[PDB]
Ligand binder design. Structure first.
Ligand code: WZY
Lengths: 178, 245
């Protein structure tokens, strides 16, 4: 098995910690959802190739511009997250997260991931967003941002229901192998 | 880690660690508060364990089995003894607070009502100055440690055999040399996340809500100071590159 490293980046409320927890346990915890994620080394077999994929979170580092880049050395694939219930988290992608990841991880594939896709058809989410003249992120808005920033690809998932979670990490493993 | 502490923190949560007949006696808000306090102590126990792997398995193993040039082991594991001292003392305080709170006749049933004061003490005065000085030095030497590791693994046969030997067991899967260094660097930025969530469930006693709000402020001040004191060291960097920063 070859060793690859994955780092997840994005705003504080983007759901990156929950995404790593659900994938590493293969379950949305029924009793207690952890506040933080330390690290994990996933055994993944994608398209016949065995990989040990080390997983890292940047949660807690958002306000610390000199500590945060220490998470980037030798990264093989970046998951750049935004929350579908937060159009504001998508607007921070092109001119905050994107130039940072391109500077510290040149030539590293970036997969733009729209998290919490289950909230796109949640009435409480639609009501709350409508108060600020907003709506949940549309699939084409996510694809267009991914196209614009030079992302390897665009994907959506729900850590709550596990839908799309396995596919994101299998695709990230394939990107890391290229 | 020692077996006693491992067993006390083996469950995924405080609600699964205590007896179900003890859990049933508490309100939902107390269970939510205790589950996050348990996570803080459990992750601190794991972080002290990461520092023991760095000091006893890697550092001491290299000094006792390998013939590395002087100052090479220090470059791979900067400040590890100082870091181990700070966190082992902090862990001792957290575990003693839990131990004092146990019900008579029980080694697992407890409720920690007064964490705030312990966190204010840890994140103020001399212990805070020592944490700021140590992480500013460690985090500025992080990139240098990783590059020194990569050079040694690629060019030194006995070093590569040593690494492959001591990292082969399944319990070391997440704890290679580079993984330990990043786990330590990321530890300090986990504290505000854990403290804010404990605070969210600590409104029942106003003194406790105030103490946790003060501790949260102190941790953030510490992080801002460490962040402002970092400049990555680079082996062979010239003075001209440094003063033209
Ligand atoms: C927070 O740390 C940094 C983030 C980005 C840069 N440089 C660029 O984004 C160049 N477009 C430099 C330091």
């Amino acid at each position: 098995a070859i060793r690859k490293k994955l780092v997840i980046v994005g705003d504080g409320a983007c759901g990156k910690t929950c995404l790593l927890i659900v994938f590493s346990k293969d379950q949305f915890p029924e009793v207690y959802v952890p506040t933080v994620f330390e690290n994990y080394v996933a055994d993944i077999e994608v398209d016949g190739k065995q990989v040990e994929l080390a997983l890292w979170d940047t949660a807690g580092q958002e306000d610390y511009d000199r500590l945060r880049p220490l998470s980037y050395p030798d990264t093989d694939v970046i998951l750049m997250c935004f929350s579908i219930d937060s159009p504001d988290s998508l607007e921070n992608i092109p001119e905050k997260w994107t130039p940072e990841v391109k500077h510290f991880c040149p030539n590293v594939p970036i997969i733009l991931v729209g998290n919490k896709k289950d909230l796109r058809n949640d009435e409480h989410t639609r009501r709350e967003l409508a108060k600020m003249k907003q709506e949940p992120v549309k699939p084409e808005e996510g694809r267009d941002m991914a196209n614009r920033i030079g992302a390897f690809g665009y994907m959506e998932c729900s850590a709550k229901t596990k839908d799309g979670v396995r596919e994101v990490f299998e695709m990230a493993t394939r990107a890391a192998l290229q | 880690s020692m077996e006693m502490d491992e067993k006390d923190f083996a469950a995924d949560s405080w609600s699964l660690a205590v007896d179900s007949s003890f859990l049933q006696q508490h309100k939902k808000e107390v269970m939510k508060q205790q589950d996050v306090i348990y996570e803080l102590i459990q992750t601190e126990l794991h972080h002290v364990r990461t520092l023991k792997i760095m000091t006893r398995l890697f550092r001491t193993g290299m000094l006792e089995e390998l013939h590395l040039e002087p100052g090479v082991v220090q470059g791979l594991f900067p400040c590890v003894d100082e870091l181990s001292d700070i966190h082992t003392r902090f862990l001792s305080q957290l575990l003693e607070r839990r131990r004092q709170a146990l019900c008579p006749g029980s080694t697992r049933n407890f409720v920690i009502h007064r964490l705030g004061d312990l966190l204010i003490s840890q994140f103020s005065g001399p212990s805070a100055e020592q944490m700021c000085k140590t992480y500013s030095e460690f985090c500025s030497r992080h990139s240098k440690a990783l590059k020194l590791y990569k050079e040694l693994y690629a060019r030194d046969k006995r070093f590569q055999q040593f690494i492959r030997k001591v990292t082969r067991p399944a319990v070391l899967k997440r704890h290679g040399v580079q993984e330990c260094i990043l786990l330590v660097t990321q530890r300090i930025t986990k504290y505000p996340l854990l403290i804010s969530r404990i605070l969210q469930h600590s409104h029942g006693i106003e003194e406790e809500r105030q103490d946790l709000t003060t501790a949260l402020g102190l941790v953030k001040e510490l992080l801002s100071n460490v962040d402002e004191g970092i400049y990555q060291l680079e082996k062979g960097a010239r003075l001209q590159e440094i003063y033209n920063r």
